[PDB]
Design a protein around this ligand. Structure first.
Ligand code: CLA
Ligand code: CLA
Ligand code: CLA
Ligand code: CLA
Ligand code: CLA
Ligand code: CLA
Ligand code: CLA
Ligand code: CLA
Ligand SMILES: CC1=C(/C=C/C(C)=C\C=C/C(C)=C/C=C/C=C(C)/C=C\C=C(C)\C=C\C2=C(C)CCCC2(C)C)C(C)(C)CCC1
Ligand SMILES: CC1=C(C/C=C(\C)CCC[C@H](C)CCC[C@H](C)CCCC(C)C)C(=O)c2ccccc2C1=O
Ligand code: SF4
Ligand code: SF4
Ligand code: SF4
Lengths: 163, 730, 80, 64, 105, 141, 105
């Protein structure tokens, strides 16, 4: 553990919160009959709730005095105390997806501007071209460093200034 | 009527009256002005603001001594409530005077919220006579300054322009005398007077020469045994007034708080302002003034130029830019003063310097909120007055290749990066708050994204807080930083920080994490709104020459797609909305986190501050119960004045929406219709205006509506802050 | 009492003259352009500061600018 | 011939202009001593909606 | 007191029940209402200049739209304000009423 | 023109019942404007202040309180009916001034007699910064 | 003349209608509830409305003899209960209903 936080398995308030959230459904389940569809819906919600709590405990999460799980952000403490999947690993997952959107839109912009009437290509897209680039962007990091090391990424003082 | 401007006097409309007030103290744009007459008129006016300050302080002393309960408060500071000024409102009824006479005084009164009672009591004031004597002293000092502003304007006693542009002499005299000697004397007061008054001894003008502060006297000071003044410090079991548990020390480095009065030791603060006097006197002897020794300011700036050329020419050409531009000097002063004003707010609540201030919950709030709100207003002025420099007092050819031109050259990069920070901070902060608002709503409070602020908890562990268990150097007994300062400050410091019943380094959770991130978004975006109005003050692609028009103008017309709100004045105008929004969050976070502490239930903030409905349910709606019942149909309490003001703010805030939303053109056509009626009416037509009536200008309405907007944004919270905290008394 | 200054980039379009209602702009011959015309602002005392003229100017940046200033009865458009 | 060739692209150097450090086709050039003879046409509009403007000899330079 | 501070108890305490949607719309409506104030109080001049400094970065990376970005027109700015203004002002009541009245009293 | 046409203050006016957009106390005290034109037939036209009125064959005369009210009518007559109006300015003292076709030719057409005014021989921009003129008025002049 | 005469009415109403609300607030905060505008107070009752309620209530007797009852129970009568809840019952107009009806105008 770290930062004076208990694991969620050993916490009492964590189990208190489980017994509470299930008690609401059991009271709500008493109204309806056993074989009815409202009964099946609530039993599934009961099954999901029981699964949500045990999985968060199994994953070595850290619960505070309030009883709710807390996340850790420094990769040093995350890797040292086995909490990397929380924040440190979600960061790489998103950046790969965010870069993919940039490398794709940047290429559609450059290529349509090499032809006549690029304004029409923005409001009326070339879907065959857009899908081609969208399935060619799996290795977007390679092309970026290829384009940076080459020097064809940035423009050089051919841009408008104001003074 | 404006004599300083003939252009407005010829105006026949009411625009003359309004613009005559707003351009009153703008001496540069006046008619027949000169650079020498400008500095003199400023120097005389700056004497005036001192005269109002010393009088404003004199009024509080008199109105407290004459009408307050300072003599009764010292005997029982905790239970007795302070009294600011009495009330005489003949429109009252009998139930109100019976409710507003809660104080021991006969008639109705207003309970104080500033905290002057705790301050005056600490420095050794224990009677109403001593406040009467003081109110006369400042009123004399106030009159002296008024006489000087008139005297130093006369044909003689009229300073020359070279006298104003002598920076090296001003620094040495102001750093050494105004800062140092004043700090040295304040230590002379704490030693010769205040510490004795704490330990029972009555020291005054009658007996300060006969009474020694220390038994040994000054013979340790000359001999070099300076540790004799720190021998017998005050014990923990020490009453702040009586000699029970007293000591003989005058300078000590105990650290921490005094046990009974949760406040800093007087012997420490006496030792503090002494060392500050030494550094500031030493710094005062730095620059060169009429003797061979000393540094020169221009020689330094010309020298600090890096060789490779990362900054080009560097800091060259800047001395004549700063020394000749008053707006430059004013932006730096506001920037520095604005920041300091926030330190006063952040460092007082955590380190109470006065006696029985931690217990006065209502007083800590007001002081923290008042300093924070002023901080933002002062900070906004520094940028705004920094933008006027680029228009009026900036010379590009003189400042060529230097840092100031190299910043203005690539401004598109700065404004771009600032925009990205605000966008990323805003999208993520709103998202986390929403994601938790929903997932709470579907009954699953465990699916929230609660991230622990590990980096801040790492500091508190590195500063003595053993809760988190990081076991850093200063939380570890083996480290040298614990070994050093073990005899000095750490026993008193470690006891306080680890105590979880004070505001010194409060516990942090994932709720405090989101609030800090939300603040960052407000600070970054507010700077972006201001920075843009400054750098783009000289010109934009939409308006290549803004500099020719001025700082404040309507617009350049409906052409080029529309140019409404381009001027740098309109950037400052929009930042104030954000400023108030930023300080609001900062202040909402202080109040609730402290209420839960004072009420004892800290779990209220930790669990409910993670989702927005907690802020609306548990903080706003809940604590607005005793306030709203100030005047009920059954009766009225003492909080009726605050509920009335409560609504008064809600109303003023809404009236500004008129001037903001509804523009001029709707109204001028309307005033033309009333003019027709006033002339066609049989008897009223005999009366005729001297100045023609017209609607308010475009820029005037932006100003007026912002005043109605900000006053409601302050009067509403002040009532809520004082009423919520006063009614619960915790 | 507004100020109206025309600059060297005028090309003699006459669109500024046709637009401004108060007849504050007229055309004068000149040798700088193809059209051999240039504007002028003889009577700015009647300028209401509407700024329609600047909109008419079809150059990269305006050869006609109306620098607002001190007001008057004629400038404020007061029928009364 | 006094100035750049017909149909030739050139780069602008007016600091005031919307098209500054940008490229445009030369539509025509007048050789009668006018101060601003060079007529240039750009694809991108300005804020008003105009895509042409007469520039000078010194204010234009070769592309890129 | 007796209308707002009282009848708002059913909406606020709706979290964890079937009326939870009204508690969300109650807040969402306040957001859209305030959001309109940016459009009514400001003007198209500040925005069009800000986009220029943004176009520089999009231009620096050779990723810029051929359709030039332009700030919302003065008339549109005003229309966009009153729309988000009325929507937030009306939707609040729609949440403050149905939650109050469905949970009778 | 060849010569300025002096004002005939007694000419028939159009047939107009009246309205509330007429003249106020400013007119008798400070100044007012009057417009003249010559129509070939009887027609209907929109007034700047108020509603519709019927012209009269021959000379016509109106009185207005603003120059914009007069020039607003010239643009209507020159476009719709293709006429040539001329309007003056009358002070309270009785003085009269002939304003709009001051040269006889409308301003949108050149004439050799005219002389340039407020003509800067430089490009927009390309002018001194305000600091150079910090203590007197004007950066553009 | 239209806009001028109509401007005077709006100012007349907002003062004599909204100003009455502020008078009651100020009187209450000062501890003078006897001076407010209310039922136990300086009553301003809508006599014209009250007379119309009774006229439509006593219509089946005289003005509409074949009518078995009145058009609605809002005019006057007895309560109609359904499922332990009241469907409609007579609405009484007082000093408050006088201020609000004017606030609308
Ligand atoms: C390929 C499209 C594209 C690309 C590559 C970029 C890239 C960039 N933008 Mg950006 N932007 C875009 C579209 C794009 N933008 C659009 C459509 C808008 C209008 C909403 C903006 C508005 C905008 C602002 C206000 C800012 C940026 C900024 C930036 C820079 C920092 C990243 C950022 O936080 O931006 C912000 C990201 C967004 C606002 C999200 C854009 C919306 C989607 C997710 C992207 C559009 C993709 C496109 C529609 C798909 C077409 C693909 C094609 C095959 C059909 C960066 C270089 C910041 C900057 O100036 O850098 C310092 C900045 O302040 N952008
Ligand atoms: C050391 C402090 C200091 C000093 C010496 C100055 C000096 C000056 N400022 Mg500056 N300023 C300061 C701080 C300071 N300022 C701060 C902190 C801000 C940020 C808020 C500003 C923001 C600012 C702006 C934005 C402008 C100036 C301007 C000026 C110039 C004078 C304008 C004038 O005569 O206005 C006189 C104005 C008035 C008399 C009207 C003030 C009325 C206030 C707003 C009403 C307050 C509300 C009301 C009383 C509340 C009552 C409560 C009610 C319930 C009873 C002058 C150089 C102007 C300038 O230089 O123009 C080029 C200008 O445009 N200043
Ligand atoms: C303590 C604050 C303070 C100070 C020191 C001054 C000082 C001054 N004011 Mg000022 N003034 C103030 C507050 C202050 N004013 C406020 C709050 C208002 C608004 C009611 C004004 C409105 C005002 C006007 C209208 C005029 C002055 C003028 C003056 C100057 C008169 C010469 C003596 C002097 C510099 C006069 C001036 O411009 O002198 C040059 C002038 O005409 N003041
Ligand atoms: C700026 C300083 C300052 C301020 C704000 C006040 C404020 C006030 N004084 Mg005060 N006073 C002051 C300085 C000040 N005093 C000084 C220096 C003296 C010594 C002459 C007095 C002597 C004084 C008397 C003798 C009285 C007041 C009274 C009052 C109140 C009357 C209402 C009013 O319009 O004022 C008000 C709370 C009157 C009152 O009834 O207070 C409740 C009253 O009778 N004052
Ligand atoms: C930072 C310096 C400083 C400050 C702010 C104070 C503040 C105070 N002292 Mg203290 N004191 C100081 C230094 C200081 N002292 C030093 C260095 C000593 C050692 C001698 C003392 C010894 C002392 C005694 C013995 C007594 C005080 C008392 C007081 C209190 C009332 C004074 C009064 O009403 O004026 C009364 C003023 C006079 C009788 C005349 C003062 C004469 C000096 C030399 C004039 C200074 C004017 C100064 C230049 C003003 C600045 C403006 C300038 C441009 C003109 C007040 C809290 C009295 C008290 O009751 O406190 C508990 C008291 O009896 N003080
Ligand atoms: C512009 C982005 C940004 C900004 C302005 C801030 C600003 C702030 N953060 Mg912070 N933070 C950020 C991003 C950001 N953060 C990210 C992406 C994470 C991981 C999810 C964190 C995790 C984090 C924690 C755990 C804490 C703070 C805290 C703070 C406050 C004190 C500074 C500090 O020590 O934090 C750290 C400063 C940084 C991490 C700078 C990194 C910003 C990078 C360059 C942007 C993202 C790059 C991308 C992920 C790759 C401060 C106001 C502390 C606090 O809450 O105060 C009590 C604290 O405990 N932050
Ligand atoms: C039509 C009804 C109505 C209206 C129009 C208002 C209007 C207003 N009220 Mg109000 N109020 C009402 C009814 C109403 N109230 C009722 C019935 C009660 C209970 C009796 C209250 C009790 C009340 C209190 C106690 C207060 C107000 C305040 C305000 C003003 C704050 C405005 C603002 O923008 O500040 C800024 C808005 C915010 C900072 C956000 C609002 C609260 C959020 C949820 C806190 C979030 C902080 C945290 C950092 C998260 C945000 C970060 C983000 C990035 C996610 C405002 C003018 C406040 C005030 O006086 O202004 C200072 C004030 O303190 N009201
Ligand atoms: C709470 C905010 C507020 C207030 C107070 C007002 C008030 C008013 N509005 Mg606005 N309206 C508002 C919000 C507000 N509006 C907003 C935000 C918008 C944007 C859409 C509009 C848009 C708007 C338009 C377009 C128009 C109005 C009109 C009016 C005026 C109607 C005439 C009238 O009833 O006055 C009566 C006086 C009052 C209602 C004030 C009540 C408070 C009391 C009675 C005053 C007490 C005075 C006190 C005793 C004296 C103290 C003196 C002291 C110095 C000692 C009135 C002054 C109309 C108008 O002006 O033409 C007639 C107009 O057409 N409103
Ligand atoms: C536009 C303009 C301008 C601007 C201004 C401004 C606005 C500025 C700013 C700003 C500010 C207002 C700032 C502040 C600051 C502060 C800082 C930056 C700090 C820091 C840091 C440090 C160094 C620290 C250290 C430490 C210590 C001491 C001990 C403990 C630890 C720690 C770390 C804490 C001017 C006028 C100039 C000029 C021109 C115009
Ligand atoms: C109502 C309104 C008016 C007209 C408002 C007028 C004419 C009211 C001002 C005059 C009254 C008589 C002053 C009322 C007295 C004040 C309550 C106190 C003033 C105190 C000062 C003397 C210090 C505008 O001119 C205007 C212009 C631009 C945007 C919005 C608006 C706008 O909303
Ligand atoms: S400020 Fe008013 S007049 Fe000027 S452009 Fe904007 S809407 Fe038009
Ligand atoms: S509108 Fe501009 S380009 Fe056209 S004639 Fe006038 S000054 Fe020349
Ligand atoms: S400001 Fe208006 S009236 Fe004056 S010249 Fe320009 S367009 Fe014509």
């Amino acid at each position: 553990d770290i930062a004076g936080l208990t694991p969620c398995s050993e916490s009492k308030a964590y189990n208190k919160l489980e017994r509470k959230e299930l008690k609401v459904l059991d009271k709500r389940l008493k109204q309806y009959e056993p074989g009815s569809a409202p009964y099946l819906a609530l039993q599934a919600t009961k099954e999901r709730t029981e699964n949500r709590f045990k999985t968060y405990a199994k994953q070595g999460l850290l619960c505070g005095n309030d009883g709710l799980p807390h996340l850790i952000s420094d990769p040093g403490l995350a890797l040292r105390f086995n909490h990397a999947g929380e924040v440190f690993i979600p960061t790489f997952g998103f950046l790969y997806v965010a870069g993919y959107i940039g490398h794709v839109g940047r290429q559609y912009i450059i290529l349509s501007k090499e032809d006549a009437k690029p304004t029409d290509k923005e409001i009326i897209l070339d879907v065959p071209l857009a899908l081609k680039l969208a399935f060619q962007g799996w290795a977007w990091p390679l092309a970026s460093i290829q384009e940076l090391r080459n020097g064809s990424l940035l423009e050089k003082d051919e841009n408008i200034t104001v003074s | 009527f404006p004599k300083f401007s003939q252009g407005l006097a010829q105006d026949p409309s009411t625009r003359r009256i309004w613009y005559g007030l707003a351009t009153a103290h703008d001496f540069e744009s006046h008619d027949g002005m000169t650079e020498e007459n400008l500095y003199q008129k400023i120097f005389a006016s700056h004497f005036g603001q001192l005269a109002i300050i010393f009088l404003w302080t004199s009024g509080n002393l008199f109105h407290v001594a004459w009408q307050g309960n300072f003599e009764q408060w010292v005997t029982d500071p905790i239970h007795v409530r302070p009294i600011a000024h009495a009330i005489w409102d003949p429109h009252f009824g009998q139930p109100a005077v019976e409710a507003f006479t809660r104080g021991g005084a006969s008639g109705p009164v207003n309970i104080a919220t500033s905290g002057v009672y705790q301050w005056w009591y600490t420095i050794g004031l224990r009677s109403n006579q001593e406040l009467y004597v003081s109110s006369v002293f400042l009123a004399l000092v106030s009159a002296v300054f008024l006489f000087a502003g008139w005297l130093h304007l006369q044909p003689n006693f009229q300073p020359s322009l070279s006298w104003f542009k002598d920076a090296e002499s001003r620094l040495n005299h102001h750093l050494a005398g105004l800062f140092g000697v004043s700090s040295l004397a304040w230590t002379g007061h704490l030693v010769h007077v205040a510490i004795p008054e704490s330990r029972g001894q009555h020291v005054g003008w009658d007996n300060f020469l006969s009474v020694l502060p220390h038994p040994q006297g000054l013979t340790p000071f000359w001999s070099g045994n300076w540790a004799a003044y720190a021998q017998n410090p005050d014990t923990a079991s020490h009453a702040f007034g009586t000699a029970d548990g007293s000591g003989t020390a005058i300078l000590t480095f105990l650290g921490g708080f005094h046990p009974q009065t949760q406040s800093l030791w007087l012997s420490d603060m006496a030792h503090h302002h002494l060392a500050i006097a030494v550094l500031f006197i030493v710094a005062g002897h730095m620059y060169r003034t009429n003797f061979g020794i000393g540094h020169r300011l221009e020689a330094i700036l010309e020298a600090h130029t890096p060789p490779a050329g990362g900054l080009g020419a560097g800091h060259k050409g800047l001395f004549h830019t700063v020394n000749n531009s008053l707006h430059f000097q004013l932006g730096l002063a506001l920037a520095s003063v604005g920041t300091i004003t926030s330190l006063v707010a952040q460092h007082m609540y955590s380190l109470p310097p006065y006696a029985y201030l931690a217990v006065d919950f209502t007083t800590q709030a007001s002081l923290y909120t008042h300093h924070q709100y002023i901080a933002g207003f002062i900070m906004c002025g520094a940028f705004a007055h920094g933008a006027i420099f680029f228009i009026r007092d900036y010379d590009p050819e003189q400042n060529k290749g230097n840092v100031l031109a190299r910043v203005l050259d690539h401004k598109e990069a700065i404004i771009s990066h600032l925009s990205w920070v605000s966008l990323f901070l805003g999208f993520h902060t709103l998202g986390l708050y929403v994601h938790n608002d929903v997932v709470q709503a579907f009954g699953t409070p465990e699916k929230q994204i609660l991230i622990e602020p590990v980096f801040a908890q790492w500091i508190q562990a590195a500063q003595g807080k053993s809760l988190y268990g990081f076991d850093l150097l200063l939380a570890s007994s083996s480290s040298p930083a614990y070994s050093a300062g073990q005899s000095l400050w750490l026993p008193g410091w470690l006891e306080a920080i680890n105590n979880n019943q004070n505001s010194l380094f409060l516990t942090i959770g994932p709720g405090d994490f989101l609030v800090h991130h939300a603040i960052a978004l407000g600070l970054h975006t507010t700077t972006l709104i201001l920075v843009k109005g400054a750098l783009d003050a000289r010109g934009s692609k939409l308006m290549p020459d803004k500099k020719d028009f001025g700082y404040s103008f309507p617009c350049d017309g409906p052409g080029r797609g529309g140019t409404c709100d381009i001027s740098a004045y309109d950037a400052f105008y929009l930042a104030v909305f954000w400023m108030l929004n930023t300080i609001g969050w900062v202040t909402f976070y202080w109040h609730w986190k402290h209420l839960t502490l004072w009420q004892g239930n800290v779990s209220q903030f930790d669990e409910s501050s993670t989702y927005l409905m907690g802020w609306l349910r548990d903080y706003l709606w809940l604590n607005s119960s005793q306030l709203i019942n100030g005047y009920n149909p059954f009766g009225m309490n003492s909080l009726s004045v605050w509920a009335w003001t409560f609504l008064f703010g809600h109303l003023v805030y809404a009236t500004g929406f008129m001037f903001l939303i509804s523009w001029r053109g709707y109204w001028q056509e309307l005033i033309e219709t009333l003019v027709w009626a006033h002339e066609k009416t049989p008897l009223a037509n005999l009366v005729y205006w001297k100045d023609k009536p017209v609607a308010l200008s475009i820029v005037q309405a932006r100003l007026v509506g912002l005043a109605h907007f900000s006053v409601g944004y302050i009067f509403t919270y002040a009532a809520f802050l004082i009423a919520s905290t006063a009614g619960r008394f915790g | 009492a507004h100020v109206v200054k025309i600059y060297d980039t005028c090309i003699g379009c006459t669109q500024c003259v046709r637009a401004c209602p108060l007849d504050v702009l007229e055309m004068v011959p000149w040798d700088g352009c193809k059209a051999a015309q240039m504007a002028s602002s003889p009577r700015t005392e009647d300028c209401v500061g509407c700024k329609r003229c600047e909109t008419a100017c079809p150059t990269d940046f305006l050869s006609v600018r109306v620098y607002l200033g001190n007001e008057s009865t004629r400038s404020l458009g007061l029928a009364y | 011939e006094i100035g750049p060739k017909r149909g030739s692209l050139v780069k602008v150097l007016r600091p005031e202009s919307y098209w500054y450090n940008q490229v445009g086709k030369v539509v025509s050039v007048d050789q009668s001593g006018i101060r601003y003879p060079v007529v240039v046409r750009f694809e991108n509009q300005n804020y008003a909606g105009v895509s042409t403007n007469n520039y000078a000899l010194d204010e234009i330079e070769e592309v890129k | 007191r007796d209308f707002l501070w009282a009848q708002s108890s059913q909406v606020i305490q709706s979290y964890g029940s079937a009326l939870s949607a009204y508690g969300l719309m109650f807040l969402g409506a306040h957001f859209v209402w305030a959001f309109s104030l940016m459009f009514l109080f400001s003007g198209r001049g500040y925005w069009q200049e800000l986009i220029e400094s943004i176009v520089w970065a999009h231009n620096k990376l050779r990723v810029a739209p051929s359709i030039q970005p332009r700030a919302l027109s003065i008339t549109q700015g005003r229309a966009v304000g009153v729309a988000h203004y009325l929507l937030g002002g009306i939707a609040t009541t729609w949440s403050f009423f149905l939650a109050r009245i469905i949970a009778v009293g | 023109p060849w010569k300025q046409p002096e004002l005939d203050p007694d000419t028939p006016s159009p047939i107009f019942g009246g309205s509330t957009g007429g003249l106020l106390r400013k007119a008798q005290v400070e100044e007012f404007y009057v417009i003249t034109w010559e129509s070939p037939k009887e027609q209907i036209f929109e007034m700047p202040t108020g509603g519709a009125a019927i012209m009269r064959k021959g000379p016509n005369l109106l009185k207005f309180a603003r120059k914009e009210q007069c020039m607003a009518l010239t643009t209507q007559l020159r476009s719709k009916f293709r006429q040539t109006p001329c309007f003056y300015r009358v002070y309270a003292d009785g003085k009269v001034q002939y304003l709009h076709p001051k040269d006889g030719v409308y301003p949108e057409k050149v004439n050799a007699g005219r002389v340039g005014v407020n003509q800067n021989m430089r490009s927009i921009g390309k002018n001194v910064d305000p600091i150079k003129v910090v203590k007197f008025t004007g950066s553009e002049p | 003349a239209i806009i001028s005469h109509l401007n005077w009415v709006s100012i007349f109403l907002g003062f004599h209608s909204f100003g009455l609300y502020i008078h009651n607030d100020t009187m209450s905060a000062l501890g003078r509830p006897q001076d407010m505008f209310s039922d136990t107070a300086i009553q301003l009752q809508p006599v014209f409305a009250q007379w119309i309620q009774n006229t439509h209530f006593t219509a089946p007797q005289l003005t509409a003899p074949n009518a078995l009852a009145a058009t609605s129970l809002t005019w006057g009568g007895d309560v109609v209960a359904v499922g332990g809840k009241v469907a409609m019952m007579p609405i009484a107009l007082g000093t408050s209903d006088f201020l609000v009806h004017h606030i609308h105008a």
